[PDB]
Amino acid sequence: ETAAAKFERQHMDSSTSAASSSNYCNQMMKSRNLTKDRCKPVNTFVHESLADVQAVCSQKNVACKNGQTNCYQSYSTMSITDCRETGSSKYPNCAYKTTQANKHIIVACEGNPYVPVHFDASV
């Protein structure tokens, strides 16, 4: 999988404007194949058009939590859903807590074309 495609598969959900129910994370973590060989412990889905997320690579340049300087913060807030494993959860019965919010996203960009390859954080 290319870096751009992996980002898309793990973080884009443009078909809904916001986390539906408390079971959104259980459904999405499984359908995007993030529960396949293990339970991905934390994952954030973004509910905006791909174009709008790709446009962040030309917005505010900031440092990544890792120290690199190819991170960018979205000027505006975006609809996101944080998916986190609950203290109970254990493979292969992955269980997730769903938290819907509107925050600025931070992503790492790379390549040509220059697009998002990593979800750094939200604020």
Ligand X SMILES: *CC(=O)NCCNc1cccc2c(S(=O)(=O)O)cccc12
The residues assigned a catalytic role are 11, 118
Q: What is the Cβ-side half-sphere exposure of residue 112, based on CA atoms within 13 angstroms?
A: 0
The beta-carbon contacts of 54-58 under 8 Å, at least 24 apart in sequence, are 54/115, 54/116, 56/105, 56/107, 56/109, 56/116, 57/107, 57/109, 57/114, 57/115, 57/116
In this structure, the strands spanning 60-62 and 42-46 are unpaired
Nearer to Cl ion, 35 or 90 (CB): 35
5 binds, among ligand X, Cl ion, none (CB under 5 to 8 A by kind): Cl ion
Binding ligand X (rule: CB under 6 A), the pick from 10, 26, 81, 122 is 10
Binding ligand X (rule: CB under 6 A), the pick from 32, 45, 47, 118 is 118
122 binds Cl ion (CB under 5 A): no
Nearer to ligand X, 11 or 47 (CB): 11
Nearer to ligand X, 67 or 88 (CB): 67
Query: How is the chain split among helix, strand and coil, in percent rounded to 5?
Result: 20, 35, 45
4 binds Cl ion (CB under 5 A): yes
Residue 41 assigned as binding residue: yes
Binding-site residue numbers for substrate are 6, 9, 40-44, 65, 84
